[PDB]
Amino acid sequence: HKAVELSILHINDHHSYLEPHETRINLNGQQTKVDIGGFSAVNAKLNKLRKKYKNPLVLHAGDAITGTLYFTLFGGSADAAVMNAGNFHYFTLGNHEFDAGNEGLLKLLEPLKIPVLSANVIPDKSSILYNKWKPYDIFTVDGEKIAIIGLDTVNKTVNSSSPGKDVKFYDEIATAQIMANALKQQGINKIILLSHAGSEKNIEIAQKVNDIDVIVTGDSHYLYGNDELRSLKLPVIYEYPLEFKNPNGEPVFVMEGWAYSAVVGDLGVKFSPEGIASITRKIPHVLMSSHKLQVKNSEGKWAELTGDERKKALDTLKSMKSISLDDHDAKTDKLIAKYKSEKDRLAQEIVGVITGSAMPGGSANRIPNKAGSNPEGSIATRFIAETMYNELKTVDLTIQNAGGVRADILPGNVTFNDAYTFLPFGNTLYTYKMEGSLVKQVLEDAMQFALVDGSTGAFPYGAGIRYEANETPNAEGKRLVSVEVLNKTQQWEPIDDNKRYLVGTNAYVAGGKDGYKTFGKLFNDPKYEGVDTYLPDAESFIKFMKKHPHFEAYTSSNVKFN
Amino acid sequence: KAVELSILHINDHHSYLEPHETRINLNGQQTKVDIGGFSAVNAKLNKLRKKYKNPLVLHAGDAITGTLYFTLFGGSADAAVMNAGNFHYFTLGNHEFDAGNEGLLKLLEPLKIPVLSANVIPDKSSILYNKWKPYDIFTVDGEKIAIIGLDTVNKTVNSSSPGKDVKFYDEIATAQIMANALKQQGINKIILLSHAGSEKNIEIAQKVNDIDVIVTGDSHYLYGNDELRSLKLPVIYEYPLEFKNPNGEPVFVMEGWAYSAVVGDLGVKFSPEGIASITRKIPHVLMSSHKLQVKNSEGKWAELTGDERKKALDTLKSMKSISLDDHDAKTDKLIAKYKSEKDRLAQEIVGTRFIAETMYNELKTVDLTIQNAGVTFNDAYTFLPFGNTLYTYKMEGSLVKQVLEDAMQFALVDGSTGAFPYGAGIRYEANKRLVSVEVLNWEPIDDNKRYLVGTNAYVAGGKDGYKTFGKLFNDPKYEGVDTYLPDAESFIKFMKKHPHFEAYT
Numbered sequence A: 001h002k003a004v005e006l007s008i009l010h011i012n013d014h015h016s017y018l019e020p021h022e023t024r025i026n027l028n029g030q031q032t033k034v035d036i037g038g039f040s041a042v043n044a045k046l047n048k049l050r051k052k053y054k055n056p057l058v059l060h061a062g063d064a065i066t067g068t069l070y071f072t073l074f075g076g077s078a079d080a081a082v083m084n085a086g087n088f089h090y091f092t093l094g095n096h097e098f099d100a101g102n103e104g105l106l107k108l109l110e111p112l113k114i115p116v117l118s119a120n121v122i123p124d125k126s127s128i129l130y131n132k133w134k135p136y137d138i139f140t141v142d143g144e145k146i147a148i149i150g151l152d153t154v155n156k157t158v159n160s161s162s163p164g165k166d167v168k169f170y171d172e173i174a175t176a177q178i179m180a181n182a183l184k185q186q187g188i189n190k191i192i193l194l195s196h197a198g199s200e201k202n203i204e205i206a207q208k209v210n211d212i213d214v215i216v217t218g219d220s221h222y223l224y225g226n227d228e229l230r231s232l233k234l235p236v237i238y239e240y241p242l243e244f245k246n247p248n249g250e251p252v253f254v255m256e257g258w259a260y261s262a263v264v265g266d267l268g269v270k271f272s273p274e275g276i277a278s279i280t281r282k283i284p285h286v287l288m289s290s291h292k293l294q295v296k297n298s299e300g301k302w303a304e305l306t307g308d309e310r311k312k313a314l315d316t317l318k319s320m321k322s323i324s325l326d327d328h329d330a331k332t333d334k335l336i337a338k339y340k341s342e343k344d345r346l347a348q349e350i351v352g353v354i355t356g357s358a359m360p361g362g363s364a365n366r367i368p369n370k371a372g373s374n375p376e377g378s379i380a381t382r383f384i385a386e387t388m389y390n391e392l393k394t395v396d397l398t399i400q401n402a403g404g405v406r407a408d409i410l411p412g413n414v415t416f417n418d419a420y421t422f423l424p425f426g427n428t429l430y431t432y433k434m435e436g437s438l439v440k441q442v443l444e445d446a447m448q449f450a451l452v453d454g455s456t457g458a459f460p461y462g463a464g465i466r467y468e469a470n471e472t473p474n475a476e477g478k479r480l481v482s483v484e485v486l487n488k489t490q491q492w493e494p495i496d497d498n499k500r501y502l503v504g505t506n507a508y509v510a511g512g513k514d515g516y517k518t519f520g521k522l523f524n525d526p527k528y529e530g531v532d533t534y535l536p537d538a539e540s541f542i543k544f545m546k547k548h549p550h551f552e553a554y555t556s557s558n559v560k561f562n
Numbered sequence B: 001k002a003v004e005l006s007i008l009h010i011n012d013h014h015s016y017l018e019p020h021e022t023r024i025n026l027n028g029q030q031t032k033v034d035i036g037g038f039s040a041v042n043a044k045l046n047k048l049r050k051k052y053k054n055p056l057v058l059h060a061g062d063a064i065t066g067t068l069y070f071t072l073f074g075g076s077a078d079a080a081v082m083n084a085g086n087f088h089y090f091t092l093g094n095h096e097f098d099a100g101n102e103g104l105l106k107l108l109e110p111l112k113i114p115v116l117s118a119n120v121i122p123d124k125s126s127i128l129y130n131k132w133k134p135y136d137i138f139t140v141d142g143e144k145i146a147i148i149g150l151d152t153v154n155k156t157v158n159s160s161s162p163g164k165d166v167k168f169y170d171e172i173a174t175a176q177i178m179a180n181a182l183k184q185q186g187i188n189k190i191i192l193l194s195h196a197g198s199e200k201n202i203e204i205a206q207k208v209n210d211i212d213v214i215v216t217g218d219s220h221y222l223y224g225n226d227e228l229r230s231l232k233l234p235v236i237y238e239y240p241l242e243f244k245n246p247n248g249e250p251v252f253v254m255e256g257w258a259y260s261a262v263v264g265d266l267g268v269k270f271s272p273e274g275i276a277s278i279t280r281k282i283p284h285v286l287m288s289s290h291k292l293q294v295k296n297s298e299g300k301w302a303e304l305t306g307d308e309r310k311k312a313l314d315t316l317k318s319m320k321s322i323s324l325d326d327h328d329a330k331t332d333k334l335i336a337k338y339k340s341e342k343d344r345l346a347q348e349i350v351g352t353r354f355i356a357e358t359m360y361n362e363l364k365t366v367d368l369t370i371q372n373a374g375v376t377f378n379d380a381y382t383f384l385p386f387g388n389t390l391y392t393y394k395m396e397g398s399l400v401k402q403v404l405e406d407a408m409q410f411a412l413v414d415g416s417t418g419a420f421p422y423g424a425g426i427r428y429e430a431n432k433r434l435v436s437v438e439v440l441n442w443e444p445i446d447d448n449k450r451y452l453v454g455t456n457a458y459v460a461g462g463k464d465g466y467k468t469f470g471k472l473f474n475d476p477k478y479e480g481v482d483t484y485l486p487d488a489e490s491f492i493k494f495m496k497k498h499p500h501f502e503a504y505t
């Protein structure tokens, strides 16, 4: 065994953020709007750093895809192209990789030339994903063997993404230890884990599992930082590398690179002959533009700095080692110019007009009456539900999960791109015939998942149904105070547990995802006459808008949540 | 390349160096015969491996605990006879930990057989560190073949004594992850040597891919055939079982009974693509030709004579799955040495409610034990002639009272007074005959609380009128398990831990 030094460069969770995005910092004492990220800055910085450092190891810790129109419109081909241009050594699968099913994942993997690793996600032989990735790789540096293992988060993928049933998932901690243990007898004492299990689970692995030296993290989107970054009031969660001792007393380093192509992590690691890691360099590079520097003027208006105030702002950023200004890569610039111009072209198309008041939607408004939300919660989800109700003509009632609607819906023109921003998942519409008591329970299941067990995106809003609920469950464990269904006489009347209703919803929750346990029990059980309408979600919405000139926005969500 | 493998395996010999007696149905008559013993095991292994191409010789775990050969030699006798058999691989079972990490080391030090276990992983500062590997790879006619070791988890952690510095991982997850990782080393032929038990190994076969053969230990099941069924041996399954994994590939699962009684013998052909097919399947029951006892008309077990004996032997000699009078010189010599040593020091000094206390003393986890009415090492075996093992159920206090009611009923009304129950960690008065029942943490019993209850294997079955046990038996909700801890050893431990022990009043 010999000692070796590695230069780890990594990103994670870029989520199809190919362009820079806006963030706020505290610079020279003032809240300042700047632009950060974009894949051009990422590839440029990776290219420069890798050429400067010995033994570069370039990693992407997962969730390359989903989150912007660059995914929705181009099905992952845009992301594959920019990642190829980055010449990453390895990519691990995240949870959102499965958001569009095995088919969706395949469309990313076909054009991707980066080796893919995932040890706890294993496709059956009949899967279209069979032989598309390996559990680990071994590469050699200066004579010595180093192993790298891939790992994915399980529950969030299985419960809230859409992996095919022919893809099997295994416990994160056990997989990490079994993999690492097996690698030892191949003469290996230097082991990297490229893990989308999230910071919480990766920290648990560092504390409970032996033989793993560095855990490059994805899924939690945490900025790991330093005093420089803290001085700018960036959202620093942890120091960049956390250092733990495993049960054998060996150091384990854990780190993430924020998200949305904002950061390139830069960790220089020295391994002793016996495989004990130590840190030689540690820099989270925040990728920032120098072009946007806006501060509120004396009137309260965001205005670009000018004159010497601007010079001072720029000069301060230049003085920081963890800030990287105006990186850009020509090859990546061209790729992004191509897709961006096609995206802009598509947005030229107006599909309709909404009048009136803005309809709150997106993450912050998923649950009514919470901090960050508003008293009605996701009116935009109620609106989408009304849209499904109308185009499913014969239905008594529709339910849509708040996570299925990705933004506020504002008055004015609605573009083709807006439709695919609100509804990016490509679900078809689905219907069941089910009794009133079952409708009540599916609402309970969804709220339990949204409020306790899983994702806020589960929170349910409906059309032709309205309800009141409390955060705090009561005696018999229930949250529902009352539910009413619209008599299609046009009068609202209490739901009765024993009548059979035709219920419309999207195919995602229809399969039991997002904790819609009842729906999942009904699925593939003739007794409930489930039917895939094959009507695509966004296409159906565009049709709705074309058939409803000047649609008046809703001002309530059909949910009263205490 | 296609290759042919000849698997030869035993499991759960549990320190049975000597043959032991069993009862078979031979020519229509209940016949006592001697089976097993490690001389016969090694002899049959030596002969078979000489005969077959590409032999792989395997021990599926629980080498130790069960007889005085363990109590007195602490595993060195076992290592010696195993070394003499030249096994290719040994996997750890649950009883390997019955005397803690230090006790396992007494087995592992003299043992020369490579040890495998993928889901039992010691920390660096464990005295067990680097004493075994998770897997091995061997070459046959150019092809790589992998073998993975595996142990049962909950049973070992809960009922044995692995050190806190030994970490256990899920059986199914470990099997899939190990097999998945081996694929990219160019391996499509994988053997799983697993003490996870037939039930778990059968679940693995149907839920895990890339594993072709699962050589089993822990359940002590006889896998046999029609020959063996005609002898009324306790054949649970056909040798071997065959399943399809999720990829549709064949998986073969087999066990070799227990207590050195059987050498399993499976010829397996692997296609170039690593798909297994069976070319030979024979569970060899190791039997003596010397003991053939049948009850005479006066009710006494007596050796067969004349033509009756000749026909009994002719039937046995005609069975492919019966192997008569195998014995190996090297192993004989070793067993002779240990046996005279054993007879000598089984005379040395070690230290119904009382027997109940020995059982309670065995497992730290039991809340109470019950035992029906019916110092030196020999002083323990003399006392306890039925050869019961400790059996446990997880059951409601109300069911505990009912078994007590059942037991007394049967002793008081249905005649058999051997049924009258006494216990440790529980006490009662009975004038429902039960007036009060108490359990120690002495509190009144709680009908709603679930107690881990231990008893002898006989009564656990539903006998002596223990109806409630009978209904819990093999009824999966009550977590019934035969621990395979002998009643005689329980007594002996009771005297050891209480070397100087003042007597109950």
Ligand SMILES: Nc1ncnc2c1ncn2[C@@H]1O[C@H](COP(=O)(O)CP(=O)(O)O)[C@@H](O)[C@H]1O
Pocket: A067, A099, A160, A161, A162, A401, A402, A403, A404, A405, A425, A427, A455, A456, A457, A458, A506, A508, A509, A514
């Ligand atoms: N096919 C689909 N249809 C509807 N909603 C979906 C969906 N796939 C994922 N989601 C929603 O997306 C949520 C998960 O992502 P979150 O939006 O909470 C995290 P992130 O996308 O902002 O990184 C799920 O709980 C679910 O509500």
Ligand SMILES: Nc1ncnc2c1ncn2[C@@H]1O[C@H](COP(=O)(O)CP(=O)(O)O)[C@@H](O)[C@H]1O
Pocket: B372, B373, B374, B386, B388, B416, B417, B418, B419, B456, B458, B459, B464
């Ligand atoms: N394997 C076993 N374990 C515990 N007790 C057993 C047993 N086999 C038989 N017995 C006990 O022996 C009783 C019957 O034996 P006998 O009654 O002929 C002798 P005894 O009771 O007069 O001494 C049974 O009812 C039962 O209590």
Ligand SMILES: [Zn+2]
Pocket: A013, A015, A063, A094, A096, A219, A220, A221
């Ligand atoms: Zn993410």
Ligand SMILES: [Zn+2]
Pocket: A013, A062, A063, A094, A095, A096, A196, A218, A219, A220
């Ligand atoms: Zn993620």
Ligand SMILES: [Zn+2]
Pocket: B012, B014, B062, B093, B218, B219, B220, B484
């Ligand atoms: Zn056993």
Ligand SMILES: [Zn+2]
Pocket: B012, B061, B062, B093, B094, B095, B195, B217, B218, B219
């Ligand atoms: Zn066992």
